[PDB]
Amino acid sequence: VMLQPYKHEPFTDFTVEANRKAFEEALGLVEKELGKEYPLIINGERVTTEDKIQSWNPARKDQLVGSVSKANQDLAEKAIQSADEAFQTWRNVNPEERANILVKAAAIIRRRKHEFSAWLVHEAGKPWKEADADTAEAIDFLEYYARQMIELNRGKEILSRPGEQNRYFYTPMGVTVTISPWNFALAIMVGTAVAPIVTGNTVVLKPASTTPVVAAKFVEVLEDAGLPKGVINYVPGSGAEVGDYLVDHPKTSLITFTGSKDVGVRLYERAAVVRPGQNHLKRVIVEMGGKDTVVVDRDADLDLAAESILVSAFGFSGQKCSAGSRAVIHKDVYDEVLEKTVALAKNLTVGDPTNRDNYMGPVIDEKAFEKIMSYIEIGKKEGRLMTGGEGDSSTGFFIQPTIIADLDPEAVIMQEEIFGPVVAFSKANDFDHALEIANNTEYGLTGAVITRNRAHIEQAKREFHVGNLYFNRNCTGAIVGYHPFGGFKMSGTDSKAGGPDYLALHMQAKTVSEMY
Template structure:
């Protein structure tokens, strides 16, 4: 592939970078409360019904509002996307890639501004917001370069007297349903993967974080994307989402979100409707119940740090977050003690003030997580945290629940908050068995200095992304392609060498000479 190097993260230990971020926060603050219309076929459409985005750290503060699409407007967007597809699919891959390169350059120039918006709209601390923005840039750069290689197709054998060619062509209109927890990186990544491969898109972002998506659509237009290639249609999942998933002209769906919604989409997309000529393709990432395994032969300080960082970064609101720590009994007490000490030093507060842990996303998430904390009191022993405060924002103290049985709810159900369960294993083999005893298979990590146990885990730990001697979060585009097994989704490796092909179909042509 054409040389690629991921976007470096900002070093916030430098005063100049701190000052730049503070300046960006003030700029974003001064522009809050604006309205963003739908974008359909390049046309701005304002509707009477709005989706209001609030700051989860200051729940009275309005980030902005976006117009809300209904089924009539969803159909209008579908027709615009179908029309645009007829020309966009014939545009040279080089030109499509150029749009991504230009968009990446625009975002890079406005990097802190986008990150500051993530701090306000999604409650992301500085570092987490900066990583989100960097990943969005990475997706654009990586997929653009990858498309420049894929445009050549793949080599085939030819016999004397014939010439065979293997090429990739786009699918059609795709529905992109993006999540709130990586509202820039995943939204941008799934969108640009769809369009650089020649498809057109109906973008339905998460209702809690629609403003950053609206801003990104503006970036794509500034980069030269033609009208109708990306149509911005935030709206209700039950109304707009279901309608578009069922639509006979929908060719593929890219979804990132909960298991329940993902399975619902999977079921609906499997049905063939009148006028439909294909089986719809689904690219889904549906969450995880991720485990860090600690061997008795391990750096215990590294183990504790990896657990705390992976469990509580962005308040545990990552599908890759460590929500289970399975520790061999020989070192269980020592790792638990070290993790408790580290957790007690973690700061919780408004992410604009650069605390390590900010708020959870909204009232529903707050109530759900606090309910799991109560379950933790019954299933184990809360050794730190266990409290929350939703007076001004949705803040929950990082919580460790010790001595939890492997089959307990806390060890089986995705919590999506700053809660981690500790479970004891008699040996490394049992630790791997416990790690595998969930319906999910997204990420995992093993802390060990034993090479044979490392190789056992490499073969037997059934997850899509496995890390050794580090935390289980933080996959980088092009370096650790991301996607998981089982109920974690379709193992569609975002930021990987075969991700773009999921948005295309292969065509063989054979000419007799």
């Protein structure tokens, strides 16, 4: 009766015969379930609207993954009120029991692992590897934060002088509004919903409208793991009607957001306003974009350099806030790293991600497709096209892995988040110049340095100003409890998810002192 130590959920080895077979079976399972209708969930009740959000396969744009009900202001209000009501009892449920519900939820997802992955394959267009990694990460968030809450329930040791007893401990806050992204349709949605839940807060969840079906699947799991009614509420909808209304509500205590900079800034600015009837300042956790950089030193393993750039730039087709969309390389080694990377990139497979042999799938929708292609046109003018630069939206939203070279560090494609499979190469005079270019964005989320020089490693630890800094590997693929994730500048509030400080952001410290 103690939980066994946290460790990360292993990735599935699809070279084992039985793992592929099992994954293909789960893909068949989901395919037959495609096209289903999903209600809103408010206070445990299923609420269907006739106005709907259609969710489409990005690899097959006329394949309906599902249609979910669409909330409006009035249902957002009911969702808030349900959350507030449930909080009156939820804040007093023993932290051990709250954690147990997360542990039971993890075991349901673990048992149904490939099914959750195949949902991501279909709805988010994730390749096998990325889908598995995502599902593993959601499992981790559950197991990690369950353990963290039990640790935090112990409180913190403070001093008491003779004749008094002083105690410091953490208390639940209230209604949390969780606004989740599509690119980690399961993992981040799970983390940013359960961190508030396990800390005794209640949640109103607005998933991304491009991926709401997997979120409905997850709320079903929460119910099956024994979560009381109204503790989570499932309300997809428009930003103008539901998004803005949830953030502005006087009963919203906490907001947790993951998405783009432009939506984030506006959310952060609106949340700070003390509205009528609002008796508190709202706590805001924002995780916005990155314009991340892989820097390669003159002593680097050049093959490793090219491999780390490739994976950082083209994993999930660059649709990650952590993506190495910039490659800044030492002058003595730039032409050669650039040729090694081009050589890897043009043999990468792009297609339907239900097919295992496809390394990259499509981008999320037509809006993103067009945005990425428009950046590529800008890029082609600003730099030297090396490979890719083509798109075809006729079946799915497919863009080739794209490398553009010789960019000026001030270029549009060196500065702006593209969220597509594009990396821009940039020449650096020496190591000092390389970090100068690396730091020259308005963001500070992830970065990598490839070097065999210890002094250069120590220098970048001080000088490379990103929240997640990696040496001799890719700058993507943070693991819960191993690489706590969040960053600086226009990347957000540096709320290190999957780290030891994360739960306490969701709670209020309390000091009690009895004088004898």
